Design an enzyme around this catalytic site. Structure first.
Site, PDB file in Angstrom:
ATOM      1  CB  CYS A  29      15.392  17.337 -25.458  1.00  0.00           C
ATOM      2  SG  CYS A  29      15.315  15.568 -25.912  1.00  0.00           S
ATOM      3  CG  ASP A  85      -2.033  -0.996   1.149  1.00  0.00           C
ATOM      4  OD1 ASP A  85      -2.321  -1.601   0.072  1.00  0.00           O
ATOM      5  OD2 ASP A  85      -2.627  -1.245   2.229  1.00  0.00           O
TER       6      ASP A  85
END
Lengths: 365, 365
Positions: free
Chosen positions: A171, A39
């Site tokens: 980029c 979790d």
């Protein structure tokens, strides 16, 4: 191929046999448990814009996009390996795409001053991986959940390639990287496979363009970057840039990579420890391994896998894995001493990788 | 057909002969001058988010989207009429799309509390017109400037239709209008023409659906709206709803509109002035013309044009145009007493309209 080397979790023969056995190895499964189990803190816990898993590993912000993408690429091969994990893989890819869109992931673009919108222009490392992920999600799942976004982004990429005087997309402004382009182009192939289009036709002009000042064809190595405003190429060859690029290009034009691969090995790969191990120098004119971003050996592991080179795969994984001190605790994999950024991601991907061509040909669900 | 009626600018024969002559009438040219000529204040002065033209005409905010769209529809027919005006039409359609995306246009969606994003769900009047506009722009120009957006929006529309238990999409939540759907469906036909796809396949189920509780077959008329959460249909028939819907449907399924058209006329159309004029009642159980939104006669003018009904077109334009007191001053058209909202837009569109099927078949530039 079949004796288990010291410190290894599974043999090279076992990794290469996963798809034929329709089953991942137990250590791959333990990696998938690391990815999915606990979790809140496992990286594939939920679709939310939470990044605890990456906080716990000290992932730099700028690296998060790459971590998610490399996980996604490995997950696509999991789907191909074991049909009984295909739904899990699809689920994880849904999460990966969700997370990839969170501003924690792409927000460097805005913080660095380049724009508020990470998709509209430039920024191909981000949007190339995103576009490839949309496609892999859809190949794995058959779901159109992201198809409207995929159709849009594919067209932005295609348009920007058509409008540029050089083949491809930058980029940061004025920074052209062949490895980042390779991911964008492969994304077009995946869109075409799913839609019956021909966006991949732009690939020929790209492969011609990168074989000019961007390559040293005798050494089988690409230069670090190209800078369209000046026409400069940064004059150092890069192993990690080359290994990544050749791996992806082998799914588009296998002959291109087959041509350069032996040269690339001679230029950068050091076999050591009586033939049992190998490590990769990042540039020319050095004896040092894994300089620069520190990823030459890990990307070469991926390339070896892509090229079917079991011996080199074995040698690299003998260099990489044992000193990182893997253990499997409660059926989940951890490394005490990861040797680089993106360590568990790239070792995952290399252990499962079925070949980019095979991912393109993935049968429907 | 060929005598000029009192107060008219051109004969009905002249309007209907524009395409054969490859020329717009002088009054249509004067309307295009109103649209394009004067700096800053003409509606098609620039791509910016500036709306001075609409401020000057006192256009209510909610109506702007409709004004732009109806201009766009007329411009597409100008492109077809006169090849020498095709570039100008393309230019104006570029502006129309640009303006259509400004928050001044779509922002009622957010102000009313329905959401911050006007595309993502519902709101089909806005996004249906936008999608149709993207398609018409591309048919006229051959430009892919908006294709990435068109591909995305078309898929959002298709997905929302597939996910709904009724055929189509709502406007405001829980408000279904057949006329707003008709525009969305036609947008799919245009996307298909341009792309070779089959999004238009959904049209059959939609035409089946609207011929249930939403139509009164005795009267060839649609009810005002449908409200999925309650299943209510507002129990009044609407002329402007019907006229608009039958006009757009005639470009998709000409037989459907042909089936209802004589009934629709009998239900709503009053011929008067010894056969010279006609005016349209908005609903049943009244003698009054042009009640409600006040657009019954003007949308019936469009329908008459779409159906090739020269006599009704002549009658309606004799009712609408002369009392509005057109004049042409410095080769630009103005009305002293526009009789409704959207007046110049709808009289423009009806004068030029080549048929929705002919627009779908527009030859390439």
């Amino acid at each position: 191929m079949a004796e288990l080397p010291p410190g290894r979790l599974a043999t090279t023969e076992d990794y290469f046999a996963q798809q034929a056995k329709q089953a991942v190895t137990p250590d791959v499964m333990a990696q998938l448990a690391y990815m999915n189990y606990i979790d809140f803190i496992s990286p594939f816990y939920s679709r939310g814009c939470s990044f605890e898993a990456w906080e716990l590993k000290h992932t730099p912000q700028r690296v998060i996009k790459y971590s998610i993408a490399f996980y996604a690429y490995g997950l696509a091969s999991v789907a191909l390996i074991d049909p009984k994990l295909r739904a899990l893989a699809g689920h994880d890819l849904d999460i990966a795409v969700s997370k990839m869109k969170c501003k924690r992931v792409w927000g460097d673009w805005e913080e660095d001053g380049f724009g508020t919108d990470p998709i509209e222009k430039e920024n191909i490392m981000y949007k190339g991986h995103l576009n490839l992920m949309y496609g892999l999600y859809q190949l794995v799942t058959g779901s159109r959940r992201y198809e409207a976004e995929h159709a849009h982004l594919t067209r932005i990429i295609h348009d920007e390639i058509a409008a540029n005087p050089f083949a491809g997309i930058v980029c940061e402004p004025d920074n052209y990287f062949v490895q980042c382009n390779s991911v964008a182009y492969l994304s077009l192939w995946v869109y075409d496979r799913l839609h019956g289009t021909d966006y991949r036709a732009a690939t020929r002009a790209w492969l011609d363009f990168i074989q000019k000042d961007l390559i040293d064809p005798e050494r089988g190595a690409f230069y670090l970057s190209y800078h369209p405003e000046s026409g400069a190429v940064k004059p150092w060859i890069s192993a990690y840039t080359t290994a990544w690029t050749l791996a992806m290009v082998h799914g588009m034009d296998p002959a291109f990579s087959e041509r350069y691969y032996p040269r690339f090995k001679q230029t950068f790969v050091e076999v050591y420890d009586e033939g049992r191990k190998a490590r990769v120098r990042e540039t020319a004119g050095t004896d040092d391994a894994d300089g620069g971003v520190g990823l030459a050996s890990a990307f070469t592991l991926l390339l070896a896998r892509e090229m079917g080179d079991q011996q080199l795969f074995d040698q690299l994984l003998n260099h990489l894995e044992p000193p990182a001190k893997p253990s499997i605790v409660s059926a989940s994999l951890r490394y005490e001493h990861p040797g680089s950024l993106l360590f568990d991601e790239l070792l995952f991907l290399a252990k499962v990788h079925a070949g980019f061509g095979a991912l393109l040909r993935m049968p429907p669900p």
